[PDB]
Design a protein around this ligand. Structure first.
Ligand SMILES: Cc1cc(=O)[nH]c(SCC(=O)c2ccc(S(N)(=O)=O)c(Cl)c2)n1
Ligand SMILES: [Zn+2]
Length: 258
């Protein structure tokens, strides 16, 4: 009876195994755009993904992860609100059963169809598993997806999903360029938070881009053909793998713009 996204093991249950679920800096949150503080001293975000080395794509039973070689400074995030260099380790998405929901962060209570998370770890801690035990260990770049025109840079991911339909499947996934998933503008909101899945550790500097990317209805439909179950088990479609907004508590969301 481990955690997941159903009636009996979904987000409202997680606090029984992971008490930090009711902690002081949990994510996601609703981003109230009117009360976000413009911080004229936040720097432009630096996204250096030219040398990125994707390796594999994996269905972990909660989402799919596209994994990167993080054993050197190839694909790094820095600047923005960050005081350190953070290496890309993986990205993944959260999405809905319907276009009207799917994102984890919300903007003035608006849900997007999905949300991309590019997970990076602070190089001062040497690897991901040590970084998540630190309050400044991770930087997650969050990007909203709306349904409209296709995202051509997404299509290589969508086309491999049928090879990783069920939990524990993986596939070689080399030479994927994550620059093809970024919107034009790097304007962002930022606040201190957590992983949005168990173990819900409070180790994340969130950086959420204001500009969503567009994906087509057919691209997101393909995400909804994945399965939470393993091969040979009863089919449970991988939809609605998002945690709802959590109390902001004693936190201020900062904006890099306007
Ligand atoms: C904290 C931890 C330690 C570990 O050894 N393995 C894992 S697997 C979960 C994981 O890496 C992860 C999942 C979701 C997120 S999210 N939705 O971007 O906040 C992150 Cl940052 C990380 N997590
Ligand atoms: Zn995530």
């Amino acid at each position: 009876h481990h955690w997941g996204y159903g009636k009996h093991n979904g987000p409202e249950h997680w606090h029984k195994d992971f008490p930090i679920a009711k902690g002081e800096r949990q994510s996601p949150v609703d981003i109230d755009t009117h009360t976000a503080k413009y911080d004229p001293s936040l720097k432009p975000l630096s996204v250096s993904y030219d040398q990125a080395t994707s390796l594999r794509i994996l269905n972990n039973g909660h989402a799919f992860n596209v994994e990167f070689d993080d054993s050197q400074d190839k694909a790094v995030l820095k600047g923005g609100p960050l005081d350190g260099t953070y290496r890309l380790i993986q990205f993944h998405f959260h999405w809905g059963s319907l276009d009207g929901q799917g994102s984890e962060h919300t903007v003035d209570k608006k849900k997007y169809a999905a949300e991309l998370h590019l997970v990076h770890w602070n190089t001062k801690y040497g690897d991901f598993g040590k970084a998540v035990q630190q309050p400044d260990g991770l930087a997650v770049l969050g990007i909203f997806l709306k349904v409209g025109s296709a995202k051509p840079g997404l299509q290589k991911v969508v086309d491999v999903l049928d090879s990783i339909k069920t939990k524990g499947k993986s596939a070689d996934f080399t030479n994927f360029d994550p620059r093809g998933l970024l919107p034009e503008s790097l304007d962002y909101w930022t606040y201190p938070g957590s992983l949005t899945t168990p173990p819900l550790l409070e180790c994340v500097t969130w950086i959420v881009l204001k500009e969503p990317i567009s994906v087509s209805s057919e691209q997101v439909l393909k995400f909804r053909k994945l399965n939470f179950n393993g091969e040979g088990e009863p089919e449970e479609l991988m939809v609605d793998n998002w945690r709802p907004a959590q109390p902001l508590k004693n936190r201020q969301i900062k904006a890099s713009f306007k």
